[PDB]
PDB file of C-alpha atoms in Angstrom:
ATOM      1  CA  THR R   1     -22.956  80.135   0.055  1.00 12.10           C
ATOM      2  CA  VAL R   2     -22.313  80.170  -3.705  1.00 13.38           C
ATOM      3  CA  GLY R   3     -22.471  76.368  -3.580  1.00 14.32           C
ATOM      4  CA  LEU R   4     -21.160  73.006  -2.229  1.00 13.54           C
ATOM      5  CA  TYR R   5     -18.173  71.179  -3.765  1.00 12.74           C
ATOM      6  CA  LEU R   6     -18.731  67.285  -3.565  1.00 13.01           C
ATOM      7  CA  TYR R   7     -15.785  65.011  -3.356  1.00 11.85           C
ATOM      8  CA  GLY R   8     -17.258  61.668  -2.814  1.00 15.66           C
ATOM      9  CA  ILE R   9     -19.822  59.632  -0.745  1.00 13.00           C
ATOM     10  CA  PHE R  10     -18.961  57.436   2.244  1.00 10.27           C
ATOM     11  CA  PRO R  11     -20.869  54.537   3.979  1.00 10.46           C
ATOM     12  CA  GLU R  12     -19.702  55.748   7.532  1.00  8.75           C
ATOM     13  CA  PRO R  13     -19.512  59.110   9.282  1.00  9.89           C
ATOM     14  CA  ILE R  14     -16.507  61.068   8.924  1.00 11.89           C
ATOM     15  CA  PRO R  15     -15.240  62.608  12.094  1.00 14.24           C
ATOM     16  CA  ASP R  16     -15.223  66.351  12.851  1.00 16.15           C
ATOM     17  CA  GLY R  17     -11.375  66.670  12.453  1.00 15.62           C
ATOM     18  CA  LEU R  18      -9.834  65.215  10.469  1.00 14.08           C
ATOM     19  CA  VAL R  19      -8.855  68.647   9.519  1.00 12.90           C
ATOM     20  CA  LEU R  20      -8.474  69.059   5.819  1.00 13.43           C
ATOM     21  CA  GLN R  21      -8.221  71.992   3.244  1.00 14.86           C
ATOM     22  CA  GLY R  22      -9.713  71.451  -0.231  1.00 13.24           C
ATOM     23  CA  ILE R  23     -10.598  73.288  -3.323  1.00 14.27           C
ATOM     24  CA  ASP R  24      -9.719  76.980  -3.044  1.00 14.57           C
ATOM     25  CA  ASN R  25      -8.233  76.223   0.505  1.00 12.73           C
ATOM     26  CA  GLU R  26     -11.726  75.741   2.164  1.00 11.87           C
ATOM     27  CA  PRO R  27     -12.102  73.292   4.904  1.00 14.08           C
ATOM     28  CA  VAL R  28     -13.640  69.851   4.160  1.00 14.66           C
ATOM     29  CA  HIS R  29     -16.775  68.716   5.875  1.00 13.26           C
ATOM     30  CA  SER R  30     -19.110  65.774   6.070  1.00 12.16           C
ATOM     31  CA  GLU R  31     -22.888  65.768   5.764  1.00  9.82           C
ATOM     32  CA  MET R  32     -25.352  62.840   6.301  1.00 11.36           C
ATOM     33  CA  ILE R  33     -28.096  61.940   3.892  1.00 10.68           C
ATOM     34  CA  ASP R  34     -29.739  58.512   4.225  1.00 11.31           C
ATOM     35  CA  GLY R  35     -26.794  57.224   6.254  1.00 12.74           C
ATOM     36  CA  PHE R  36     -24.362  58.080   3.620  1.00 13.60           C
ATOM     37  CA  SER R  37     -21.684  60.985   4.298  1.00 11.35           C
ATOM     38  CA  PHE R  38     -21.204  63.345   1.489  1.00 12.71           C
ATOM     39  CA  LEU R  39     -17.587  64.862   1.556  1.00 10.39           C
ATOM     40  CA  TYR R  40     -17.840  68.508   0.669  1.00 13.97           C
ATOM     41  CA  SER R  41     -16.476  71.919   0.836  1.00 16.88           C
ATOM     42  CA  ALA R  42     -17.692  75.534   0.193  1.00 13.61           C
ATOM     43  CA  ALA R  43     -17.388  76.374  -3.508  1.00 14.67           C
ATOM     44  CA  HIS R  44     -16.274  79.844  -4.873  1.00 13.41           C
ATOM     45  CA  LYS R  45     -17.444  79.081  -8.174  1.00 15.80           C
ATOM     46  CA  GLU R  46     -20.524  77.295  -9.693  1.00 20.35           C
ATOM     47  CA  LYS R  47     -18.319  75.996 -12.618  1.00 19.69           C
ATOM     48  CA  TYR R  48     -14.797  74.810 -12.009  1.00 20.41           C
ATOM     49  CA  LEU R  49     -12.745  74.152 -14.986  1.00 21.15           C
ATOM     50  CA  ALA R  50     -10.594  70.938 -14.977  1.00 27.03           C
ATOM     51  CA  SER R  51      -7.060  72.315 -14.508  1.00 31.04           C
ATOM     52  CA  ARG R  52      -4.078  70.321 -13.565  1.00 31.30           C
ATOM     53  CA  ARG R  53      -3.767  72.043 -10.218  1.00 34.44           C
ATOM     54  CA  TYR R  54      -7.644  71.614  -9.462  1.00 33.74           C
ATOM     55  CA  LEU R  55      -7.654  67.905 -10.435  1.00 31.34           C
ATOM     56  CA  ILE R  56      -4.534  67.289  -8.093  1.00 29.02           C
ATOM     57  CA  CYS R  57      -6.266  69.084  -5.331  1.00 31.46           C
ATOM     58  CA  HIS R  58      -9.483  66.889  -5.727  1.00 31.85           C
ATOM     59  CA  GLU R  59      -7.571  63.690  -5.676  1.00 33.51           C
ATOM     60  CA  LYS R  60      -5.429  64.809  -2.775  1.00 36.87           C
ATOM     61  CA  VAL R  61      -8.509  65.579  -0.548  1.00 35.65           C
ATOM     62  CA  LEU R  62      -9.795  61.981  -1.367  1.00 35.08           C
ATOM     63  CA  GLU R  63      -6.259  60.375  -0.592  1.00 34.64           C
ATOM     64  CA  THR R  64      -5.821  62.236   2.676  1.00 39.19           C
ATOM     65  CA  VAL R  65      -9.093  60.880   3.738  1.00 39.01           C
ATOM     66  CA  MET R  66      -8.292  57.260   2.480  1.00 35.97           C
ATOM     67  CA  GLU R  67      -4.981  57.412   4.447  1.00 38.75           C
ATOM     68  CA  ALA R  68      -6.849  58.493   7.626  1.00 40.43           C
ATOM     69  CA  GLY R  69      -8.617  55.308   7.448  1.00 38.92           C
ATOM     70  CA  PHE R  70     -11.721  55.895   5.378  1.00 37.04           C
ATOM     71  CA  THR R  71     -11.013  53.677   2.561  1.00 36.27           C
ATOM     72  CA  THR R  72     -14.455  52.800   1.321  1.00 35.20           C
ATOM     73  CA  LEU R  73     -16.068  55.344  -1.034  1.00 34.22           C
ATOM     74  CA  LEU R  74     -17.700  56.255  -4.342  1.00 37.25           C
ATOM     75  CA  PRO R  75     -15.506  59.030  -5.502  1.00 37.57           C
ATOM     76  CA  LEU R  76     -17.257  61.804  -7.622  1.00 36.46           C
ATOM     77  CA  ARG R  77     -15.693  62.925 -10.789  1.00 38.21           C
ATOM     78  CA  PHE R  78     -14.200  66.388 -10.683  1.00 33.65           C
ATOM     79  CA  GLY R  79     -16.157  69.773 -10.488  1.00 33.51           C
ATOM     80  CA  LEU R  80     -19.481  68.829  -9.108  1.00 32.80           C
ATOM     81  CA  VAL R  81     -20.878  71.771  -7.400  1.00 32.41           C
ATOM     82  CA  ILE R  82     -24.478  71.863  -5.811  1.00 32.74           C
ATOM     83  CA  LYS R  83     -26.174  75.154  -4.846  1.00 31.91           C
ATOM     84  CA  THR R  84     -27.853  73.590  -1.799  1.00 32.51           C
ATOM     85  CA  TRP R  85     -28.677  70.189  -0.225  1.00 28.87           C
ATOM     86  CA  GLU R  86     -31.967  70.250  -1.942  1.00 28.10           C
ATOM     87  CA  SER R  87     -30.229  69.036  -5.128  1.00 26.63           C
ATOM     88  CA  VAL R  88     -29.348  65.814  -3.008  1.00 27.03           C
ATOM     89  CA  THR R  89     -32.527  65.262  -1.073  1.00 28.20           C
ATOM     90  CA  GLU R  90     -33.415  62.083   0.831  1.00 27.05           C
ATOM     91  CA  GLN R  91     -36.307  61.714  -1.994  1.00 30.44           C
ATOM     92  CA  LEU R  92     -33.671  61.442  -4.651  1.00 34.35           C
ATOM     93  CA  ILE R  93     -31.338  59.084  -2.558  1.00 37.44           C
ATOM     94  CA  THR R  94     -33.958  56.642  -1.374  1.00 39.23           C
ATOM     95  CA  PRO R  95     -34.490  54.660  -4.621  1.00 39.22           C
ATOM     96  CA  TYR R  96     -30.728  54.271  -5.168  1.00 41.22           C
ATOM     97  CA  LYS R  97     -30.260  53.581  -1.337  1.00 43.77           C
ATOM     98  CA  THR R  98     -30.119  49.658  -2.058  1.00 44.09           C
ATOM     99  CA  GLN R  99     -27.600  49.973  -4.875  1.00 40.76           C
ATOM    100  CA  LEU R 100     -25.424  52.064  -2.830  1.00 39.70           C
ATOM    101  CA  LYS R 101     -25.519  49.786   0.245  1.00 40.23           C
ATOM    102  CA  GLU R 102     -24.685  46.948  -2.099  1.00 40.72           C
ATOM    103  CA  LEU R 103     -21.866  48.751  -3.760  1.00 40.18           C
ATOM    104  CA  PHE R 104     -20.215  49.637  -0.360  1.00 43.26           C
ATOM    105  CA  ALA R 105     -20.570  46.086   0.772  1.00 44.51           C
ATOM    106  CA  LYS R 106     -18.306  44.739  -2.153  1.00 41.75           C
ATOM    107  CA  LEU R 107     -16.050  47.821  -1.678  1.00 41.42           C
ATOM    108  CA  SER R 108     -15.489  47.678   2.136  1.00 42.04           C
ATOM    109  CA  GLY R 109     -11.795  46.751   3.002  1.00 39.80           C
ATOM    110  CA  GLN R 110     -11.005  46.717  -0.683  1.00 40.36           C
ATOM    111  CA  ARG R 111      -8.590  48.819  -2.550  1.00 38.49           C
ATOM    112  CA  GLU R 112      -8.075  49.819  -6.231  1.00 38.90           C
ATOM    113  CA  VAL R 113      -4.676  49.480  -7.896  1.00 37.79           C
ATOM    114  CA  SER R 114      -4.024  49.845 -11.474  1.00 35.85           C
ATOM    115  CA  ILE R 115      -1.275  48.715 -14.045  1.00 38.88           C
ATOM    116  CA  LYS R 116      -0.525  50.339 -17.461  1.00 39.41           C
ATOM    117  CA  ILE R 117       1.995  48.858 -19.856  1.00 39.84           C
ATOM    118  CA  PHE R 118       4.009  50.649 -22.648  1.00 41.87           C
ATOM    119  CA  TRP R 119       6.431  49.301 -25.231  1.00 44.35           C
ATOM    120  CA  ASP R 120       8.154  50.479 -28.391  1.00 44.87           C
ATOM    121  CA  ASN R 121       5.545  50.006 -30.916  1.00 46.01           C
ATOM    122  CA  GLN R 122       7.639  50.583 -34.069  1.00 49.64           C
ATOM    123  CA  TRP R 123      10.215  48.155 -32.820  1.00 48.27           C
ATOM    124  CA  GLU R 124       7.678  45.494 -32.000  1.00 45.25           C
ATOM    125  CA  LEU R 125       5.844  46.053 -35.346  1.00 45.59           C
ATOM    126  CA  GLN R 126       9.013  45.580 -37.145  1.00 45.01           C
ATOM    127  CA  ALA R 127       9.904  42.671 -35.100  1.00 44.43           C
ATOM    128  CA  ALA R 128       6.670  40.874 -35.725  1.00 42.82           C
ATOM    129  CA  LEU R 129       6.863  41.393 -39.496  1.00 45.71           C
ATOM    130  CA  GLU R 130      10.343  39.560 -39.565  1.00 42.03           C
ATOM    131  CA  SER R 131       9.047  36.641 -37.781  1.00 40.65           C
ATOM    132  CA  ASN R 132       6.554  36.005 -40.476  1.00 40.50           C
ATOM    133  CA  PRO R 133       8.000  35.945 -44.039  1.00 39.78           C
ATOM    134  CA  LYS R 134       4.450  35.038 -45.647  1.00 40.82           C
ATOM    135  CA  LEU R 135       2.981  38.449 -44.728  1.00 41.27           C
ATOM    136  CA  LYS R 136       5.909  40.483 -45.899  1.00 44.26           C
ATOM    137  CA  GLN R 137       5.759  38.987 -49.358  1.00 46.00           C
ATOM    138  CA  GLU R 138       1.942  39.491 -49.668  1.00 48.29           C
ATOM    139  CA  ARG R 139       2.274  43.123 -48.603  1.00 46.47           C
ATOM    140  CA  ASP R 140       4.868  43.812 -51.122  1.00 47.07           C
ATOM    141  CA  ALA R 141       2.921  42.025 -53.857  1.00 49.76           C
ATOM    142  CA  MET R 142      -0.356  43.340 -52.884  1.00 56.77           C
ATOM    143  CA  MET R 143      -0.061  45.866 -55.522  1.00 58.66           C
ATOM    144  CA  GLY R 144      -0.351  44.369 -59.049  1.00 56.21           C
ATOM    145  CA  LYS R 145      -3.148  42.017 -57.747  1.00 55.65           C
ATOM    146  CA  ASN R 146      -5.575  45.003 -57.748  1.00 56.88           C
ATOM    147  CA  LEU R 147      -7.455  44.041 -54.617  1.00 53.08           C
ATOM    148  CA  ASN R 148     -10.832  45.006 -53.383  1.00 50.57           C
ATOM    149  CA  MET R 149     -10.957  47.144 -50.111  1.00 50.79           C
ATOM    150  CA  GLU R 150     -11.914  43.950 -48.132  1.00 51.62           C
ATOM    151  CA  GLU R 151      -8.818  42.013 -49.277  1.00 52.40           C
ATOM    152  CA  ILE R 152      -6.676  45.152 -48.283  1.00 55.94           C
ATOM    153  CA  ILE R 153      -8.112  45.189 -44.859  1.00 58.19           C
ATOM    154  CA  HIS R 154      -7.785  41.455 -44.427  1.00 61.52           C
ATOM    155  CA  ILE R 155      -3.960  41.929 -45.041  1.00 62.46           C
ATOM    156  CA  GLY R 156      -3.742  44.643 -42.388  1.00 60.81           C
ATOM    157  CA  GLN R 157      -5.877  42.340 -40.019  1.00 59.66           C
ATOM    158  CA  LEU R 158      -3.149  39.583 -40.494  1.00 56.58           C
ATOM    159  CA  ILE R 159      -0.371  42.153 -39.812  1.00 55.46           C
ATOM    160  CA  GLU R 160      -2.021  43.211 -36.609  1.00 58.44           C
ATOM    161  CA  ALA R 161      -2.870  39.541 -35.388  1.00 54.19           C
ATOM    162  CA  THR R 162       0.864  38.685 -35.062  1.00 52.16           C
ATOM    163  CA  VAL R 163       1.287  41.733 -33.006  1.00 50.13           C
ATOM    164  CA  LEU R 164      -1.779  40.896 -30.959  1.00 49.02           C
ATOM    165  CA  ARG R 165      -0.064  37.551 -29.929  1.00 51.06           C
ATOM    166  CA  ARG R 166       2.976  39.323 -28.734  1.00 50.69           C
ATOM    167  CA  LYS R 167       0.844  41.365 -26.470  1.00 50.96           C
ATOM    168  CA  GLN R 168      -1.059  38.201 -25.384  1.00 49.06           C
ATOM    169  CA  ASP R 169       2.142  36.602 -24.534  1.00 42.77           C
ATOM    170  CA  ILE R 170       3.094  39.605 -22.236  1.00 37.53           C
ATOM    171  CA  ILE R 171      -0.353  40.280 -20.794  1.00 36.50           C
ATOM    172  CA  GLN R 172      -0.863  36.603 -19.842  1.00 38.13           C
ATOM    173  CA  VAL R 173       2.110  36.618 -17.602  1.00 34.86           C
ATOM    174  CA  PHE R 174       0.127  39.592 -15.705  1.00 37.33           C
ATOM    175  CA  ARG R 175      -3.136  37.455 -15.592  1.00 39.29           C
ATOM    176  CA  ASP R 176      -1.501  34.290 -14.263  1.00 37.37           C
ATOM    177  CA  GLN R 177       0.400  36.072 -11.548  1.00 39.28           C
ATOM    178  CA  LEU R 178      -2.061  38.919 -10.256  1.00 35.87           C
ATOM    179  CA  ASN R 179      -5.732  38.241 -11.240  1.00 34.08           C
ATOM    180  CA  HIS R 180      -5.953  35.560  -8.528  1.00 36.56           C
ATOM    181  CA  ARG R 181      -4.796  38.103  -5.851  1.00 35.05           C
ATOM    182  CA  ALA R 182      -7.747  40.240  -6.980  1.00 38.68           C
ATOM    183  CA  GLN R 183     -11.523  40.203  -6.249  1.00 37.37           C
ATOM    184  CA  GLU R 184     -12.249  41.646  -9.624  1.00 37.93           C
ATOM    185  CA  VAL R 185     -10.179  42.661 -12.680  1.00 39.07           C
ATOM    186  CA  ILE R 186     -11.292  45.204 -15.203  1.00 38.53           C
ATOM    187  CA  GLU R 187      -9.367  45.865 -18.352  1.00 39.71           C
ATOM    188  CA  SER R 188      -9.852  48.923 -20.502  1.00 40.58           C
ATOM    189  CA  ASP R 189      -8.814  50.329 -23.956  1.00 36.51           C
ATOM    190  CA  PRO R 190      -5.326  51.523 -24.239  1.00 38.95           C
ATOM    191  CA  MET R 191      -5.161  55.267 -24.384  1.00 39.47           C
ATOM    192  CA  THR R 192      -2.145  55.911 -26.446  1.00 40.61           C
ATOM    193  CA  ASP R 193      -0.275  54.257 -29.327  1.00 41.90           C
ATOM    194  CA  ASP R 194       2.569  52.857 -27.136  1.00 40.69           C
ATOM    195  CA  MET R 195       0.272  51.537 -24.491  1.00 41.19           C
ATOM    196  CA  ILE R 196      -0.907  47.814 -24.771  1.00 43.61           C
ATOM    197  CA  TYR R 197      -2.675  47.151 -21.389  1.00 39.92           C
ATOM    198  CA  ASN R 198      -4.695  49.236 -19.014  1.00 39.65           C
ATOM    199  CA  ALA R 199      -6.052  47.152 -16.199  1.00 38.58           C
ATOM    200  CA  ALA R 200      -7.496  47.861 -12.691  1.00 40.70           C
ATOM    201  CA  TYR R 201      -7.668  45.571  -9.657  1.00 43.74           C
ATOM    202  CA  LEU R 202      -9.859  45.320  -6.637  1.00 43.22           C
ATOM    203  CA  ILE R 203      -7.721  43.957  -3.851  1.00 43.54           C
ATOM    204  CA  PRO R 204      -8.190  43.675  -0.165  1.00 47.96           C
ATOM    205  CA  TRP R 205      -6.332  46.836   1.401  1.00 48.39           C
ATOM    206  CA  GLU R 206      -3.862  44.905   3.471  1.00 48.93           C
ATOM    207  CA  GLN R 207      -2.627  42.787   0.546  1.00 50.49           C
ATOM    208  CA  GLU R 208      -1.216  45.748  -1.434  1.00 53.37           C
ATOM    209  CA  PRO R 209       2.604  45.224  -0.460  1.00 52.31           C
ATOM    210  CA  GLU R 210       2.346  41.670  -1.766  1.00 53.06           C
ATOM    211  CA  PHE R 211       0.731  42.694  -5.025  1.00 53.76           C
ATOM    212  CA  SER R 212       3.197  45.655  -5.330  1.00 53.74           C
ATOM    213  CA  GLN R 213       6.229  43.156  -4.746  1.00 51.58           C
ATOM    214  CA  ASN R 214       4.831  40.861  -7.490  1.00 54.21           C
ATOM    215  CA  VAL R 215       4.666  44.050  -9.917  1.00 51.57           C
ATOM    216  CA  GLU R 216       8.300  44.870  -9.433  1.00 54.03           C
ATOM    217  CA  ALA R 217       9.079  41.073  -9.851  1.00 54.43           C
ATOM    218  CA  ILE R 218       7.331  41.276 -13.184  1.00 56.11           C
ATOM    219  CA  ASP R 219       8.878  44.507 -13.946  1.00 56.99           C
ATOM    220  CA  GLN R 220      12.322  42.747 -13.556  1.00 54.62           C
ATOM    221  CA  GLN R 221      11.594  39.579 -15.749  1.00 55.00           C
ATOM    222  CA  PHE R 222      11.009  41.960 -18.654  1.00 55.63           C
ATOM    223  CA  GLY R 223      13.984  44.255 -19.119  1.00 55.58           C
ATOM    224  CA  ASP R 224      13.873  47.673 -20.830  1.00 55.66           C
ATOM    225  CA  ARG R 225      11.438  46.285 -23.348  1.00 57.75           C
ATOM    226  CA  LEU R 226       8.318  47.347 -21.261  1.00 59.67           C
ATOM    227  CA  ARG R 227       7.721  50.585 -19.323  1.00 59.43           C
ATOM    228  CA  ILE R 228       5.393  49.452 -16.580  1.00 60.87           C
ATOM    229  CA  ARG R 229       3.396  52.217 -14.668  1.00 59.16           C
ATOM    230  CA  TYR R 230       1.841  50.866 -11.486  1.00 56.83           C
ATOM    231  CA  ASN R 231      -0.482  53.050  -9.274  1.00 58.79           C
ATOM    232  CA  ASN R 232      -1.244  51.741  -5.773  1.00 57.63           C
ATOM    233  CA  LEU R 233      -3.243  54.860  -4.658  1.00 58.06           C
ATOM    234  CA  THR R 234      -6.205  56.304  -6.179  1.00 59.62           C
ATOM    235  CA  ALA R 235      -9.775  56.788  -5.494  1.00 59.26           C
ATOM    236  CA  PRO R 236     -11.691  53.735  -6.682  1.00 58.82           C
ATOM    237  CA  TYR R 237     -13.197  55.280  -9.681  1.00 56.84           C
ATOM    238  CA  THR R 238     -13.062  52.197 -11.888  1.00 56.41           C
ATOM    239  CA  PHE R 239     -14.896  50.055  -9.338  1.00 56.64           C
ATOM    240  CA  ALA R 240     -17.094  52.393  -7.557  1.00 56.26           C
ATOM    241  CA  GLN R 241     -19.847  52.735  -9.838  1.00 57.10           C
ATOM    242  CA  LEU R 242     -23.453  51.523  -9.979  1.00 58.05           C
TER     243      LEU R 242
END
């Protein structure tokens, strides 16, 4: 009535039940457009705000369908409400039909897992500064030399470069042991000050337990030094994009 809430797009039909409640307790259905199944439910608002509850509900809908076997999908970002199916016509989808068929081909059977790594930044900064006596003497004597802004920043560039290598020593262990298990690895910018690594992996669905086993083994190589957050179930937001 008010509109249709869109969760994601699927390369295959979703069976009638599969019974599932979604946003505002509404039942979740499937609609075919160009041989693509649009997972949806009836909206109560035209504009949904991204509250924690609503975000969790959206993700749960996608995960419940994924655990039901429907693992290949382009998950849609939160709060997409269309008024009628006229917003998503056959005419609009036909040009992007090829790109979609192609995305689902590289996605089918595959699975997104992600790893984030945290550490104590202040501790690792102070440890890097005492591993290099040269930089600590230049930093303390940089006043008196009356430097231009470039020379000042260059010193800061040398302070971070030793911290960069400490990260590269940790990060390389992950690349050596986990990248070969994956079809594609995407690395993003760290979101917080203690975060030093934010990577996503496209692995075959069935190879997850072996991947998870390797993660815990690495989490056991490093002690309390690192805080490794591994996610083995999520909609493939990182990889399912045109």
